[PDB]
Amino acid sequence: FPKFESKPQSQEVKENQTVKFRCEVSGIPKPEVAWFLEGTPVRRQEGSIEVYEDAGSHYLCLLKARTRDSGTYSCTASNAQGQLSCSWTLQVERL
């Protein structure tokens, strides 16, 4: 069943900085991790947004954080037996 072993925490940061969110999911078969911003999926870009798995940890990274990225973020681990979801916030500052 999908469980969260380590949830991403909220972070307030300056503009254009790198942000990293780390979901860590356990479960049988393999919880498919999906990320969202206020209910909208957060999909990867060429070199702006990236979503990947590395050493059992799922990641979301904004390498150049803009003010449009502020808001409530969510992560959903999902397999054939269920769906487990959690949330946190991002605050991108200006000058």
Side-chain angles (χ1 to χ4, degrees), residues 1-65 67-95:
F1 190 77
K3 177 175 182 187
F4 276 125
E5 292 290 289
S6 163
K7 297 184 291 87
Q9 241 55 243
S10 300
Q11 308 168 24
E12 57 164 36
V13 285
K14 268 160 175 168
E15 219 170 0
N16 301 317
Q17 282 173 357
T18 303
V19 189
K20 239 189 170 188
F21 295 128
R22 188 179 69 78
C23 255
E24 196 197 305
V25 310
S26 55
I28 301 296
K30 265 136 285 150
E32 184 276 319
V33 173
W35 301 85
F36 307 87
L37 166 53
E38 296 179 16
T40 311
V42 177
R43 157 179 74 81
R44 67 238 282 170
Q45 242 84 48
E46 300 300 282
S48 88
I49 301 158
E50 36 162 16
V51 300
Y52 66 104
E53 188 181 44
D54 187 23
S57 275
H58 274 88
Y59 292 90
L60 218 209
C61 166
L62 296 158
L63 25 279
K64 35 165 70 71
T67 51
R68 120 213 156 266
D69 298 321
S70 306
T72 311
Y73 281 86
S74 321
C75 173
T76 310
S78 74
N79 71 10
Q81 303 282 272
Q83 275 170 47
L84 184 65
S85 168
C86 83
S87 54
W88 64 95
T89 57
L90 186 50
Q91 169 69 94
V92 187
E93 305 185 88
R94 273 79 66 78
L95 225 158

